[PDB]
C-alpha cells in the first residue's frame, strides 16, 4: 500500500536488490532508455527519412528502437 | 516441430523426426539471443497498433501493422547476418512457405508470439539449411 | 540491468567477428557478457523459454515410457512364465522377447539411475519419439481425458475431424505390396 | 476435463490460508497485550492463557486442514498444467492463460505466489511437527515465558512466506528470519542450566552458515541484479564464480542441516535444549537449508565435480553411525541418528536437479515423523522416569508397557522395514548411488545400516528391558491419551504416506 | 494502507499503548495523551511521504548531472596514451572540441 | 561505462558506497543510542563489569530492550546492524573484493560472538533492582521508555522502511560530484 | 520515437505487402485486444468469485466443526463426560453428535467438488 | 583380552571397590524454573556413581597437547584421521570407473533450465 505505493515491487526487495544501478533505472526506465537513445533517435529519424528518398543506408539499418 | 512427414505413409499423416546439426543449433541461439529486442519490440507494436486503430472507424485502420514491418525486416536482418537480403520479402524461395504462415500467424491469426517464433525460427533454420557454408 | 564481477586473468581474448583485441581483466559488463558467460547450459539453446519448457516436459515423458517399456517387457516375461511350463519356455524366450530384453537395457532404459546420461542429440531424438506417439494419438484424439483437456465445442470438432479422418482411411485402398 | 475453477481455487486457497493464519495471530497478539497491563499469566483459572493456547492450536490445526486441502489442489493444478504444456503439439497453439488477481486481499509483499511439491511438503512438515512441539512445550510454558505460545505460529507465517515466494531476496530473507524465535525459545524456555550456553553455540554456528550464504546472495545479486528467481536462465556464470556460488552455498547451509565436522551445535543443543522444542528443532528447522540449497544450486548452472560435497556428506553418515554406539544418553543417541539422516538427505541433494531430488525429498518426510516420534518418546521417558540417560533408566517395558512397546515399534519403523516411505527413501538413494559408485554405496550402506543401527539399538534395548527394582515409590503409570495418540499419529503417517501419489515422486 | 494520515494515527496509537505497557501504568493513564499522539504522528509521517517523494524527485535529477560528471570523469581517467587510442580518441576529441562552445 | 558509436551508457551510480557507509553509521548511532538509552533509564553505578549484564534482569520491557539491542548490535538477520553489514557486503561484491568480502566476514562473525556472550552473562539469579528512588519508589522515565520503544519499533521493522532512508541517503550523497 | 502510421502511405508499398500486414476480422481484433481468445475477463471473474466463496465456506465449515467438537468432548474425564451426556436432552444429544460431522463433511465436500470436473457438457455415448 | 591391570593404554573403569564420590556434577536447572509434575511430581534422590556417569563425558577434556593420537589405538586413531580422504579418492576412482563407461557421473546436472520439480509457471493480465 502507501509505503510501497512509490513501486510495484516491494520496499525490501528496493533496498537490497538493487545496488549501484541509477535511480532513474529503477523509477521510469522508459525515460532512462530514451535518453541513452538519444542521437539514435535522430539517426532513426534521418535513416527513415533516407529510405523513403532514393538512398538506402545500411551503416544505420540496425536503429530500430521501440522504447 | 523438427518432425519430417513420411513420403510413402500408409495413413494418411506420418511424421519422423530429425535432430538439426549443431552447427545449426549453434546459429539459431546466438541469433536469437542477439536479435532478441526486434520480437519482443514486434510484440509490443503489435498490440500498440491494435490499441490505436483497433477500431473500424479509426484514420489509420487501413495503415495496420506497417509500422511493423520495420521491426521484422530488422529482426529478419538480424537473424540473417544482413544477408539474402534486406527485406523479409527477399526471403529465398526454401523458407518463403515458413515466412507467410510466420505472418499468418502473427498478424492474421494473432496468435502468441511463442507461436510464431516457432515459424520465424523455422525460416532461419530452413535458410540455414539451404546454405550451409554461407552462414556457418 | 545484468552486471559483471571483475576479471584478475591477464589473458589476451580475439574477436575475429568485430576484429578487435581486449584483455580479460579489463572487461566490462557488456564485453565479458558477449566474450565470457556465453556458453550454452541446456540441451536446446536455440529454442525459446516455452519451447524448451515443452522440450524438457517431452525428455521426462520418454524417460518414463522407455522405463514403461521396460516394465512391461518384464510383465510379458511374468506372464510368459506362468503360462507356458519351464520345457519350451527358454525356446518361446529365445525371440523378438529376449532380444526386447536386452535392447532396453540401463544404457537405453534409465531404470533407477539418478540421471540417464545423454547428449543433447539423443535428447532430440527422445523428444521426437515422444512427439511421433503424441501425433499418431491426436490423430484419432485419443487423448482427450487423458494427456489433454479440451472444452466441450473442441471435443465435437475433434469427434468430426477424427471421424471424416477414419472414413478417408477406410476408404483407402489396400497398401500394395 | 481441468477447468479454470480448479486453478483459481488452488491459487485462492494458497493465499488465503496465509491470511487466515495472519488474522488469527494478530487478533490472538492484541488481545493479549491489551488484556493486560503486564504480559505475564495470571495464576487463575481466569487467565487470558487459557485463550492463548486454544487459538494457537486450533489456529494450526485448521490451517493445516486448510493446507491439506491447498496441497491436493496444488497436486492436481501441477499435473493438469503439466498435460496442457505437453499434450498439444500444434506450432499454431500454445498455452497462454493468464490470470487476474483477486480484489479481496493484498499479495504480501507484493510478490506473485509460486508453489512446489517440494514447498508444500516443507510446509506441512511445519504443521505437523509444528503441532507435535505447540503440544509438548505446555509443560514448560509457564507465567513469564507463555510470550513464546505465539513461536509456531510466527514459524508457520514465516515458512509460509518462504515457500510461497519466487524472489531470491524474500527466499534468503524468510531463511534466515527463523534464528531469533528458535533461540528465545531455546534460552528462555529450556530448564536445563547448560541451555544458556547451547543457545550461544547454537547462535554462532548458525550464524556462521548464514553469512555464507549472505555472501553467496551477495554475489548472485550484485553480478545479476534480478530478483525474481527466473531471469537467472539468461545469465551464466563463469567457472570461478559458479564454484564460488556453490561452495559457500553447500557449505552455509550445511552450517544448518548438520553436516561433518559442523554438528556440534546440533549435539549440544539438543542435548540441552527443550524435549519440546528438540522435537521442532530436528524436524524441520535443518530442511529449510535443504530447500534452500536445492533451490539455489537448481537454479545455478555448475561445473564441478561434485565429489568433495559426496565425500564430506558421507563422512558425516560413518561419523554419526559410529558414534550411536558409544552413546548412554537418549536424547544425544537421537540427535546423532538426525545428524546421520539429515547428510543422506543432503548427500542426495549432491547430483543437481538428478531424480535423486525426489528421494530426498520423500527421505526429508520421513526423517522429520521419525525425530518428531524419537524425540516425543525421549521427552516422555525424561518426564515421567526423572532422567534421560541409560544408567539410571532401564526396564521401562515392565512398568510402562506402552512406552516399551513405542520403543519397540520406534526402533522398527527406524530400522528401514518395508511398507514404510523410510524404505522408499532408502531404496531411492541406494539404487541411485549403486549405479554412481557402487563400492561408496556398500560402504555406506553397510556403515549406516549395521553399525550404526547396532549402536543406535543397544541403548534403547538395554532401556526397555530390564528389571526396574530401584526407587519403587516413584515409578510413574503409563503414557497419556495425548502421547499415545501423537505416537500413534506418527506411525500411522510413516506407514500411510507410502500411498501417496507416484507423480510427484 | 492508502492513507498516510491514518497510518501515522494507528502508529500513534500502537506506541501510546507500548509506552504504557513498558511503564507498566494501566492503559487508561494520560487519555489526552493518545490524541496528541495521533496527530503528532499523522503530521509527521504525511510530512516524511512528501519529503521522500521529493528527495526521490531530486536525486533522478541529480543523475542527470552525474551521468555528465561519469563521462568526463571516464575520459580523465584515462591512462597516459588512451586518449588517442581508437577506443577513446573521437570520443575525446568530441568533449574537447565540440563542446568546447564557451 | 559502455560505450556504443561514442555514446556512453553508465549502469553504476558512483554516489552509492558514500549512501551505504552513510546508513551504516546512522544504524549504528541508532543502535548505540537504544542501548545507551537503556542504560540510562536505569542506575548507572550499578553496570561496572561485564557479568554486571545480569543487573539488566530486570522487568519485561528492559530485559528483552537489552537483548534485542544486544543482537541487532551483533547483526542478527531481521534486526538493524543486519541492513547495514548486508549493504556493505553487497556493496563489496558489487565492487568485487573478494579479499574484503573475506576479512570483513572474519570481523563480522568475531565482532558477533563477542556481542553474544554477554547473553550468557545476562542471567541473573533473581531479579534486579536498577531503578533510581525517588519519593520512596523506584523512578521510571515515561520519556525515555517512549524513546527507547520508537527504537525497538525501528530496529526490529527497518528492513522494512529503509528503502526511503536509502533513498533520502542516496539523494544526499548525489550532491557530491565524485 | 519513429514508430508511427505518421509518414505512412499505401502508394509506397506493394499490395502483397499491404495484404500481408492488412488488419485481420473485427472480430479477432477485438478478441485480441481484451486478451479474450481463450477465456473471457468475467469467466475469470466468476471462477474468481466462486473460488473464495469455496474457499470461505470450507474454512468456516472446519472451524465450526472443529471447535464444537472441542467444546462438546473437552468437559472432563470419561465418567464425567458419559454422566453428562447421559443428563442431556434428545435433540442436545444430536445436535453433539451431528454438529462436528456435517461441518467436516460439507468442507471435505465442497474440496471435493472442484477437483471432481462432473459438469462437463461432453457427457454422452 | 582387555585387563584393567594391564589395559595400560586402553582405558576402563578398575574392578576394585571404591567409595562413593564426595564431589561430582550434578543435575542444575535454570533460575526460577517450572518444576516439572508429570505423574504425582514425585523425585527420587540420585545415585552419586549414576550422576557421576551421566555428567563425566560431557566435562571430559584432555590433558595434554597431541595425548589425542596416542591414546587408545595409534593406527586405528590415524585410520578415522584418514576416513574423509579414503572416502574421496574411492569416489574419485568411482568416477574414473563411470567417466570411461558413459554412466552417472559425480555433477550438478542442469536438465531442467531452472524450471523446479512441478513449480506452478504462470501469468497474469
Ligand atoms: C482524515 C484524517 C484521518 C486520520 C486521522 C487524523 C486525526 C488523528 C487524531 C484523532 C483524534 C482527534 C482529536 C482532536 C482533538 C485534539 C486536541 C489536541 O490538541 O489534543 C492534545 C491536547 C492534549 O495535550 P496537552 O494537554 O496540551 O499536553 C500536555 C503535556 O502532556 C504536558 O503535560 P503536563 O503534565 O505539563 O500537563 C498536563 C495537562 C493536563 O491537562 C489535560 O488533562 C489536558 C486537557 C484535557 C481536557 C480537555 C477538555 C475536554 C473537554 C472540552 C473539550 C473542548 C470542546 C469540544 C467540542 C466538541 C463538540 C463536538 O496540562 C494542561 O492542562 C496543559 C494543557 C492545557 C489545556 C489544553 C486544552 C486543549 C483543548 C483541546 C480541545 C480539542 C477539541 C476541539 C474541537 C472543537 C469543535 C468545534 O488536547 C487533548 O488531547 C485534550 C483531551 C482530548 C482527549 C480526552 C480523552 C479523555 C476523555 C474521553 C471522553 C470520551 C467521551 C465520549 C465517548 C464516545 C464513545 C462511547
Ligand atoms: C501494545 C502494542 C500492540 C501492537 C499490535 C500490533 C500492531 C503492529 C505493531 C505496532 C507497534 C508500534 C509501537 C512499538 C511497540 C513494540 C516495541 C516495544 O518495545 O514495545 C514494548 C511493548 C511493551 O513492552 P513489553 O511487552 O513489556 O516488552 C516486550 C519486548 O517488546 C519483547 O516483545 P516481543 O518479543 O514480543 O517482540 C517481538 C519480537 C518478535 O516479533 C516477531 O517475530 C513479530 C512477528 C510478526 C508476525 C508476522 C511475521 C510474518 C513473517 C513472514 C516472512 C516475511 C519475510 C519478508 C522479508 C523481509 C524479512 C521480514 O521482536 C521482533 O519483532 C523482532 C523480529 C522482527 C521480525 C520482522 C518481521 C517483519 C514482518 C512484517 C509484517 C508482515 C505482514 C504480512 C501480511 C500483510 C501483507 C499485506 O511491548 C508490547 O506491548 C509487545 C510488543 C511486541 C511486538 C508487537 C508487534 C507484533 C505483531 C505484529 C503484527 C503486524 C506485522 C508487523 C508489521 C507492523 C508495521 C510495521
Ligand atoms: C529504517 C531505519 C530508520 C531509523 C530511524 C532512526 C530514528 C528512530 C527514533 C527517533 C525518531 C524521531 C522520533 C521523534 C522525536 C522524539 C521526541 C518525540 O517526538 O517524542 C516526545 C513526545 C512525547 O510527548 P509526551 O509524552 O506527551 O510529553 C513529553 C514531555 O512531557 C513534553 O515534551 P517536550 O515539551 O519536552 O517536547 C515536545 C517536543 C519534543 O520534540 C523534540 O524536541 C524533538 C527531538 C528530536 C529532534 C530531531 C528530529 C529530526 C527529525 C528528522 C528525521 C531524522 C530523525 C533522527 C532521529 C535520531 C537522531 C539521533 O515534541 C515535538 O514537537 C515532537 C515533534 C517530533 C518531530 C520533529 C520533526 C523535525 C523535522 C526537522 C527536519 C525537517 C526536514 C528538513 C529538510 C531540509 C531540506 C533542505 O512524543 C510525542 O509527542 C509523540 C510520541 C508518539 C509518536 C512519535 C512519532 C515519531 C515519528 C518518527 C519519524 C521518523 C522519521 C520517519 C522514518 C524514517 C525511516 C523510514
Ligand atoms: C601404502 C601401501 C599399502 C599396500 C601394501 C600392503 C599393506 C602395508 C601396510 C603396512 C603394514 C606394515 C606396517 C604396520 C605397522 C603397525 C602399525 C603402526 O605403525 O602403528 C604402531 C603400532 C600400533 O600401535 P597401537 O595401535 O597404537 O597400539 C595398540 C596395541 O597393540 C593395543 O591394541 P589392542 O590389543 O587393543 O588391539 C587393537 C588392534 C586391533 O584393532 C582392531 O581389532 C580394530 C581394527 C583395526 C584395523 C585393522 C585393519 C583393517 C584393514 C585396514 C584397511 C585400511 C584401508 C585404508 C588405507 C589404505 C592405504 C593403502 O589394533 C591394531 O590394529 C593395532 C595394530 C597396528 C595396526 C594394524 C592394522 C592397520 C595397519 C595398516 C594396514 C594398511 C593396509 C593398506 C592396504 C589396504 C588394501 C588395499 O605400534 C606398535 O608398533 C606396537 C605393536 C602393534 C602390533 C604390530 C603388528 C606387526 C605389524 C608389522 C610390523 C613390521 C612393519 C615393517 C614396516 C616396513 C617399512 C615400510
Ligand atoms: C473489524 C473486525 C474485527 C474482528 C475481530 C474478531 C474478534 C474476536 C474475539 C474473540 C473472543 C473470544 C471469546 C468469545 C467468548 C467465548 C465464550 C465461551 O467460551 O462460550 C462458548 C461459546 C459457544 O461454545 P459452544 O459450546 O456453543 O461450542 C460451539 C462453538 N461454535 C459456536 C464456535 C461452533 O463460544 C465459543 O465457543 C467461541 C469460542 C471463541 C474462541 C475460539 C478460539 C479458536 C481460534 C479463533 C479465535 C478468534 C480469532 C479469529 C478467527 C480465526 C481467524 C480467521
Ligand atoms: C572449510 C573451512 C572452515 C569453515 C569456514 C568456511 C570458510 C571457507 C568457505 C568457502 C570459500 C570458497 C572456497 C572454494 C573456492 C573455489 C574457487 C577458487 O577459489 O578457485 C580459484 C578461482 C577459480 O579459478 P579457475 O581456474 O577455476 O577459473 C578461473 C581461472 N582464470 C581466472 C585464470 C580465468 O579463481 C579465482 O577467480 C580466484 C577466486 C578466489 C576467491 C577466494 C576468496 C573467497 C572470498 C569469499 C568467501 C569468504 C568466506 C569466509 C567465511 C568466514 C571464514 C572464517
Ligand atoms: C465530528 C467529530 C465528532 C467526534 C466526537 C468524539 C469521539 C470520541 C471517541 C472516543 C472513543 C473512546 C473509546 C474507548 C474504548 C475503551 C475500551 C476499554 O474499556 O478498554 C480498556 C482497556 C484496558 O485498560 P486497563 O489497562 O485499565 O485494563 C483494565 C483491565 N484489568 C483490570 C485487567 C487491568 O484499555 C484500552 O483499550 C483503553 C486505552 C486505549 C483507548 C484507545 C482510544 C482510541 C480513540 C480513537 C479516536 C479516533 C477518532 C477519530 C476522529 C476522526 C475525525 C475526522
Ligand atoms: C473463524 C471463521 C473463519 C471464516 C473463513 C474466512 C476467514 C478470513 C479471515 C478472517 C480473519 C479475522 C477477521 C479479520 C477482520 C479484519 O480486520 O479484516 C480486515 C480486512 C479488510 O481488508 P481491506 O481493508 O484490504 O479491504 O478484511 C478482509 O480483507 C476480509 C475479512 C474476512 C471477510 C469474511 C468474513 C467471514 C465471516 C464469517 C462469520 C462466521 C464465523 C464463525 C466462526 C465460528
Ligand atoms: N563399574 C565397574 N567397573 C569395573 N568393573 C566392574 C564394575 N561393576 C562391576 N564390575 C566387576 O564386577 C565384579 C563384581 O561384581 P558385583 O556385582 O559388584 O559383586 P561383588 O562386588 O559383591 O563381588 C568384579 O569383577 C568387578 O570388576
Known amino acids: ?67 | ?136 | ?177 | ?505 | ?102 | ?178 | 520515437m519513429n514508430i508511427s502510421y505518421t509518414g505512412l502511405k499505401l502508394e509506397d508499398y506493394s499490395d502483397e505487402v499491404i495484404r500481408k500486414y492488412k488488419f485481420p476480422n473485427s472480430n479477432e481484433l477485438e478478441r485480441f485486444l481484451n486478451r479474450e481468445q481463450t477465456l473471457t475477463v468475467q469467466q475469470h471473474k466468476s471462477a474468481i468469485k466462486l473460488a473464495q466463496q469455496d474457499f470461505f465456506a470450507v474454512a468456516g465449515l472446519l472451524s465450526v466443526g472443529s471447535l464444537s467438537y472441542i467444546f462438546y468432548n473437552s468437559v472432563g474425564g470419561k465418567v464425567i463426560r458419559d454422566r453428562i451426556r447421559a443428563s442431556r436432552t434428545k435433540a442436545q444429544k444430536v445436535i453433539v453428535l451431528a454438529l462436528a460431522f456435517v461441518a467436516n463433511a460439507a468442507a471435505l465436500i465442497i474440496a471435493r467438488n472442484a477437483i471432481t470436473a462432473h459438469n462437463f457438457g461432453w457427457q454422452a455415448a | ?125
Open chain 5, 1 to 102: 494502507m492508502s492513507s498516510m494520515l491514518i497510518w501515522g494515527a494507528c502508529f500513534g496509537l500502537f506506541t501510546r499503548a507500548a509506552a504504557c505497557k513498558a511503564s507498566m501504568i494501566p492503559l487508561t493513564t494520560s487519555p489526552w495523551k493518545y490524541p496528541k499522539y495521533m496527530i503528532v504522528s499523522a503530521v509527521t509521517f504525511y510530512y516524511f511521504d512528501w519529503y521522500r517523494r521529493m528527495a526521490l524527485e531530486q536525486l533522478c535529477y541529480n543523475e542527470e548531472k552525474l551521468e555528465r560528471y561519469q563521462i568526463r570523469a571516464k575520459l580523465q581517467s584515462l591512462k597516459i596514451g588512451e586518449e588517442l587510442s581508437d577506443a577513446y580518441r573521437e570520443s575525446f576529441f568530441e568533449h574537447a572540441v565540440q563542446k568546447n562552445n564557451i
Open chain 3, 1 to 177: 540491468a545484468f552486471g559483471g564481477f571483475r576479471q584478475t586473468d591477464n589473458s589476451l581474448i580475439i574477436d575475429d567477428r568485430r576484429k578487435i583485441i581486449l584483455n580479460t581483466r579489463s572487461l566490462n559488463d557488456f564485453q565479458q557478457k558477449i566474450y565470457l558467460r556465453n556458453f550454452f547450459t541446456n540441451y536446446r539453446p536455440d529454442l525459446s523459454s516455452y519451447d524448451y519448457f515443452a522440450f524438457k516436459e517431452k525428455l521426462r515423458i520418454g524417460e518414463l515410457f522407455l522405463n514403461e517399456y521396460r516394465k512391461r517387457i518384464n510383465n510379458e516375461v511374468r506372464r510368459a512364465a506362468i503360462l507356458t511350463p519351464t520345457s519350451s519356455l527358454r525356446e518361446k524366450m529365445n525371440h523378438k522377447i529376449a532380444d526386447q530384453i536386452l535392447d532396453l537395457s540401463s544404457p537405453h532404459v534409465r531404470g533407477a539411475h539418478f540421471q540417464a546420461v545423454r547428449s543433447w542429440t539423443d535428447a532430440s531424438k527422445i523428444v521426437n519419439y515422444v512427439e511421433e506417439k503424441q501425433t499418431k494419438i491426436n490423430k484419432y484424439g485419443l487423448q482427450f481425458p487423458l494427456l489433454g483437456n479440451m472444452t466441450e465445442e473442441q471435443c465435437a470438432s475433434k469427434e468430426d475431424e477424427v471421424y471424416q479422418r477414419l472414413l478417408k482411411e477406410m476408404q483407402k485402398p489396400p497398401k500394395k505390396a
Open chain 8, 1 to 125: 583380552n582387555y585387563h584393567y591391570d594391564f589395559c595400560g593404554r586402553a582405558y576402563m573403569g578398575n574392578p576394585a571397590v571404591q567409595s562413593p564420590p564426595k564431589e561430582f556434577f550434578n543435575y542444575h536447572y535454570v533460575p526460577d524454573n517450572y518444576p516439572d509434575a508429570l505423574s504425582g511430581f514425585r523425585i527420587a534422590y540420585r545415585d552419586p556413581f549414576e550422576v557421576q556417569h551421566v555428567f563425566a563425558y560431557e566435562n571430559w577434556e584432555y590433558q595434554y597437547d597431541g595425548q589425542w593420537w596416542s591414546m587408545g589405538s595409534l593406527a586405528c586413531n590415524v585410520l578415522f584421521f584418514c576416513t574423509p580422504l579414503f572416502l574421496y579418492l574411492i569416489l574419485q576412482v568411482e568416477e574414473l570407473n563411470s567417466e570411461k563407461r558413459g554412466g552417472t557421473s559425480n555433477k550438478f546436472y542442469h536438465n531442467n533450465a531452472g524450471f523446479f520439480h512441478f513449480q506452478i509457471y504462470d501469468n497474469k493480465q
Open chain 6, 1 to 178: 561505462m559502455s560505450i556504443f558509436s561514442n555514446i556512453w551508457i553508465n549502469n553504476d551510480l558512483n554516489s552509492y558506497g558514500l549512501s551505504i557507509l552513510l546508513l551504516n553509521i546512522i544504524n549504528y548511532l541508532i543502535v548505540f543510542m537504544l542501548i545507551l538509552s537503556v542504560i540510562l533509564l536505569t542506575n548507572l553505578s550499578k553496570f561496572k563489569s561485564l557479568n554486571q549484564f545480569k543487573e539488566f534482569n530486570s522487568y519485561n520491557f528492559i530485559l528483552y530492550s537489552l537483548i534485542f539491542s544486544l543482537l541487532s548490535m551483533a547483526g542478527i538477520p531481521p534486526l538493524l546492524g543486519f541492513t547495514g553489514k548486508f549493504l556493505a557486503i553487497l556493496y563489496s561484491s558489487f565492487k568485487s573484493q573478494y579479499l574484503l568480502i573475506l576479512f570483513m566476514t572474519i570481523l563480522n562473525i568475531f565482532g558477533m560472538y563477542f556481542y553474544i556472550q554477554n547473553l550468557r552473562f545476562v542471567v541473573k539469579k533473581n531479579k534486579s533492582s536498577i531503578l533510581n528512588y525517588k519519593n520512596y519508589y523506584v523512578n521510571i522515565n515515561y520519556s525515555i521508555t517512549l524513546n527507547i520503544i520508537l527504537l525497538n519499533f525501528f530496529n526490529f521493522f527497518g528492513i522494512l522502511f529503509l528503502s526511503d532512508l536509502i533513498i533520502i541517503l542516496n539523494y544526499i550523497s548525489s550532491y557530491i560530484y565524485i
Open chain 4, 1 to 505: 476435463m481441468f477447468n479454470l475453477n480448479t486453478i483459481y481455487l488452488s491459487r485462492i486457497f494458497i493465499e488465503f490460508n496465509f491470511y487466515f493464519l495472519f488474522f488469527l495471530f494478530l487478533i490472538s497478539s492484541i488481545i493479549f497485550y491489551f488484556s493486560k497491563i503486564i504480559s505475564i499469566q495470571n495464576l487463575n483459572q481466569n487467565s487470558v492463557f487459557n485463550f492463548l493456547k486454544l487459538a494457537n492450536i486450533f489456529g494450526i490445526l485448521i490451517s493445516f486442514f486448510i493446507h491439506i486441502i491447498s496441497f491436493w489442489f496444488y497436486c492436481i493444478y501441477s499435473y493438469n498444467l503439466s498435460l496442457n504444456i505437453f499434450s498439444d503439439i500444434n506450432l499454431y497453439n500454445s498455452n497462454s492463460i493468464e490470470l487476474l488477481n483477486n480484489s479481496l486481499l493484498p499479495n504480501y509483499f507484493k510478490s506473485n505466489i509460486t508453489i512446489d511439491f517440494f514447498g508444500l511438503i516443507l510446509l506441512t512438515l511445519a504443521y505437523i511437527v509444528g503441532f507435535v512441539s505447540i503440544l509438548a512445550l505446555d509443560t514448560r510454558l509457564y507465567w513469564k515465558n507463555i510470550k513464546y505460545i505465539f513461536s509456531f505460529t510466527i514459524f508457520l507465517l514465516i515458512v509460509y512466506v518462504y515457500v510461497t515466494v519466487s524472489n531470491i531476496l524474500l527466499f534468503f530473507m524468510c531463511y534466515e528470519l527463523l534464528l531469533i524465535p528458535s533461540f528465545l525459545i531455546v534460552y528462555f524456555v529450556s530448564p536445563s542450566r547448560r541451555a544458556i550456553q547451547a543457545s550461544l553455540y547454537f547462535v554462532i554456528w548458525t550464524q556462521l552458515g548464514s553469512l555464507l550464504v549472505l555472501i553467496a546472495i551477495s554475489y548472485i545479486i550484485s553480478i545479476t541484479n534480478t530478483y525474481e528467481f527466473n531471469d537467472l536462465k539468461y545469465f551464466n556464470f563463469t567457472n570461478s564464480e559458479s564454484t564460488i556460488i556453490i561452495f559457500l552455498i553447500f557449505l552455509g547451509f550445511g552450517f544448518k542441516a548438520p553436516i561433518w565436522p559442523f554438528h556440534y551445535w546440533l549435539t549440544k543443543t539438543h542435548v540441552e535444549a527443550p524435549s519440546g522444542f528438540s522435537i521442532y528443532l530436528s524436524g524441520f528447522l535443518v530442511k529449510t537449508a535443504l530447500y534452500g540449497f536445492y533451490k539455489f544450486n537448481t537454479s545455478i548452472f555448475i561445473d564441478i565435480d561434485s565429489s568433495i560435497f559426496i565425500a564430506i556428506c558421507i563422512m558425516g553418515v560413518v561419523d554419526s553411525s559410529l558414534k550411536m554406539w558409544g552413546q548412554t544418553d537418549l536424547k544425544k543417541l537421537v540427535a546423532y541418528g538426525t545428524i546421520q539422516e539429515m547428510n543422506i538427505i543432503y548427500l542426495a541433494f549432491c547430483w543437481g536437479d538428478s531424480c535423486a531430488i525426489l528421494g530426498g525429498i520423500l527421505f526429508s518426510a520421513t526423517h522429520a515423523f521419525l525425530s518428531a516420534l524419537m524425540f516425543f518418546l525421549v521427552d516422555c521417558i525424561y518426564r515421567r522416569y526423572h532422567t534421560r540417560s541409560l544408567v539410571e533408566v532401564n526396564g521401562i517395558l515392565h512398568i510402562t508397557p506402552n512406552l516399551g512397546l513405542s520403543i519397540l515399534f520406534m526402533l522398527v519403523f527406524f530400522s528401514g522395514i518395508p511398507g514404510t516411505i523410510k524404505f522408499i527413501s532408502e531404496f531411492y538413494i541406494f539404487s541411485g548411488l549403486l549405479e554412481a559408485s557402487p563400492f561408496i554405496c556398500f560402504i555406506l550402506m553397510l556403515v549406516a545400516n549395521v553399525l550404526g543401527l547396532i549402536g543406535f539399538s543397544k541403548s534403547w534395548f538395554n532401556a526397555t528391558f530390564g528389571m526396574p527394582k530401584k526407587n519403587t515409590k516413584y515409578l510413574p503409570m503409563d503414557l497419556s491419551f495425548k502421547e499415545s495418540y501423537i505416537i500413534l499419529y506418527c506411525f500411522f503417517f510413516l506407514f500411510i504416506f507410502s500411498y501417496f501419489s507416484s507423480i510427484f515422486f
Open chain 2, 1 to 136: 516441430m523438427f518432425l519430417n512427414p513420411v513420403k510413402d505413409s500408409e495413413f494418411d499423416d506420418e511424421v519422423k523426426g530429425f535432430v538439426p546439426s549443431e552447427g545449426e543449433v549453434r546459429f539459431v541461439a546466438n541469433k536469437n539471443k542477439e536479435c532478441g529486442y526486434y520480437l519482443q519490440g514486434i510484440e509490443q507494436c503489435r498490440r500498440k497498433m491494435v490499441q490505436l486503430a483497433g477500431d473500424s472507424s479509426s484514420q489509420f485502420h487501413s495503415l495496420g501493422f506497417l509500422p511493423c514491418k520495420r521491426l521484422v525486416d530488422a529482426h529478419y536482418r538480424c537473424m540473417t547476418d544482413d544477408k539474402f537480403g534486406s527485406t523479409i520479402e527477399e526471403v529465398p524461395e526454401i523458407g518463403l512457405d515458413s515466412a507467410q504462415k510466420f505472418f499468418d500467424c502473427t498478424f492474421q491469426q494473432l496468435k502468441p508470439m511463442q507461436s510464431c517464433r516457432r515459424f520465424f525460427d523455422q525460416v532461419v533454420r530452413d535458410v540455414y539449411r539451404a546454405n550451409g557454408s554461407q552462414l556457418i
Open chain 1, 1 to 67: 500500500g502507501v509505503w510501497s505505493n512509490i513501486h510495484p515491487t516491494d520496499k525490501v526487495t528496493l533496498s537490497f536488490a538493487n545496488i549501484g544501478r541509477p535511480f532513474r533505472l529503477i523509477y521510469r526506465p522508459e525515460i532512462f532508455l530514451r535518453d541513452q537513445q538519444a542521437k539514435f533517435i535522430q539517426l532513426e529519424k534521418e535513416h527513415i527519412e533516407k529510405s523513403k528518398k532514393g538512398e538506402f543506408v545500411e551503416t544505420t539499418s540496425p536503429l530500430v528502437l521501440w522504447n
